Amino acid sequence: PPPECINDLLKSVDSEEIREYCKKKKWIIPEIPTNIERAM
Amino acid sequence: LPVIAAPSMWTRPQIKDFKEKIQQDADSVITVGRGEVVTVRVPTHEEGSYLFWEFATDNYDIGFGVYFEWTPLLDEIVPVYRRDCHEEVYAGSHQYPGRGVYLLKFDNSYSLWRSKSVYYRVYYTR
């Protein structure tokens, strides 16, 4: 699963369905942020 | 020096599905106060290619941008600009310039009277 092609897909066809499928095939891995900073 | 690839950005019409899905899986909904800038730090994974982001808001627009912090140098990936993400979901992607940390800036600085509810989702590829 090439990274560049996963991108053209989601651009053109994007939904919860594509996202979950891409999650299923482990093409996209859910990300965990580290810090969430707050400023004024 | 390292050449930085251009980010990709787009939108998808189904906003209600996104916010519905977000609330289900986890509670991560950032409430950006008046005149506030929230920065979500998203580091790169040792074996990883791209970072994909999604974000949306309930009643109002908000500023969004993406910076990259090296391994404190800062590259500007998506310049901070106001998006109408209350109408639609906003998505985008970028290829790793190298080893570092992505800064997703949600910028409410301009808004005097209005807090913004931010639903977001992040992914990466391998």
Residue numbers in the entry:
A (entry chain B): 15 to 54
B (entry chain A): 366 to 436, 474 to 528
From the publication, what sentences describe this entry?
ACBD3 is a Golgi resident protein involved in the maintenance of the Golgi structure and regulation of intracellular trafficking between the endoplasmic reticulum and the Golgi. However, in enterovirus-infected cells, the ACBD3 GOLD domain interacts preferentially with viral non-structural 3A proteins, which causes re-localization of ACBD3 to the sites of virus replication. In this study, we present a structural, biochemical, and biological characterization of the complexes composed of human ACBD3 and the 3A proteins of four representative enteroviruses.
Of the six GOLD: enterovirus 3A complexes, only GOLD: 3A/EVD68 and GOLD: 3A/RVB14 formed crystals that diffracted to a resolution suitable for subsequent structure determination (i.e. 2.3 Å and 2.9 Å, respectively). Analysis of the crystal structures of the GOLD: 3A complexes revealed that the 3A proteins formed either one of the crystal-packing contacts (as in the case of EVD68 and PV1) or contacts with the second 3A molecule when two GOLD: 3A complexes per asymmetric unit were present (as in the case of EVA71 and RVB14). Surprisingly, the C termini of the 3A proteins, which in the cellular environment are anchored to the membranes, are located on the opposite sides of the GOLD: 3A heterotetramers. The dissociation constants of the GOLD: enterovirus 3A complexes ranged approximately from 1 μM (EVD68 and RVB14) to 15 μM (EVA71). The overall structures of all solved GOLD: 3A complexes are highly similar to each other.
